[PDB]
A paper describes a structure:
For this purpose, fatty acid binding proteins (FABPs), small proteins which act as intracellular lipid chaperones, are good models since they have a large internal cavity occupied by a fatty acid (FA) and a stable cluster of well ordered water molecules. FABPs are 14–15 kDa proteins that reversibly bind hydrophobic ligands, such as saturated and un­saturated long-chain FAs. The binding pocket is located inside the β-barrel, the opening of which is framed by the N-terminal helix–loop–helix ‘cap’ domain, and FAs are bound to the interior cavity.
In this work, the structure of perdeuterated human H-FABP was determined for the first time at room temperature with combined neutron and X-ray diffraction data to resolutions of 1.90 and 0.98 Å, respectively (for statistics of the data collection and refinement). Analysis of the electron and nuclear scattering density maps showed that oleic acid (the FA naturally bound to H-FABP expressed in E. coli) does not occupy the whole internal cavity. The FA (yellow C atoms) is folded in the typical U-shaped conformation systematically observed in complexes between FABP and long-chain FAs. The water molecules are packed against the oleic acid and are connected with the external solvent through a narrow pore. These water molecules are very well ordered, even at room temperature (mean B factor for the O atoms = 15.6 Å2), more so than the oleic acid which presents a non-H-atom mean B factor of 32.5 Å2, ranging between 11.8 Å2 for the carboxyl group to 48 Å2 for the terminal methyl C atom. W31, located at the top of the U-shape of the FA, acts as a C—H⋯O hydrogen-bond acceptor in three interactions, with H⋯O distances of 3.46 (donor group is C5—H52), 3.38 (C3—H31) and 2.55 Å (C18—H181). This way, the conserved W31 water molecule bridges both extremities of the FA, clearly contributing to stabilizing its folded ‘U’ conformation. The aliphatic tail of the FA is mostly in contact with hydrophobic residues, allowing the formation of numerous intermolecular H⋯H bonds as well as two intramolecular ones, revealed by the presence of BCPs and bond paths. (iii) Within the cluster, the positions and orientations of the water molecules are strongly determined by the alignment of the water dipoles along the electrostatic field of the hydrated protein.
Author numbering: 1 to 131
Write the structure that this text describes.
Amino acid sequence: VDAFLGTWKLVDSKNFDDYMKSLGVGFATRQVASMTKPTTIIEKNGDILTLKTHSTFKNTEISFKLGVEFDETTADDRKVKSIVTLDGGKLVHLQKWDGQETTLVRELIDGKLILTLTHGTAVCTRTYEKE
Ligand SMILES: CCCCCCCC/C=C\CCCCCCCC(=O)O
């Protein structure tokens, strides 16, 4: 997982409104989210990964072991059961709640971190660059 480690800043986003709307996020939160450029920090300490997402709007932090389920409260206030694994060199984060699922997939492509978010028919792509 070592190539994912570091500090990353958002530089491009496509279809995030569609993804938020699919999750039921209200229009006022979508407004602010469309103008926010988060910083994501990924760190490791032995087998424990910590993923921080910082912005002027909301901040989140989770710590987990790969392949072990954990409880997570998301930035939009869903209480989900999560698991993160490495699949084909990608970091795959699966969230389940109320019979629903969403995936947050991170892959490294030409030095950039590409985050693909899928829920329902909505697919959002967010591109991060390393700081
Ligand atoms: C912590 C800041 C995340 C981005 C601004 C706040 C958005 C909150 C609205 C819906 C959350 C949807 C699920 C999390 C999206 C994370 C996107 C990302 O890491 O770039």
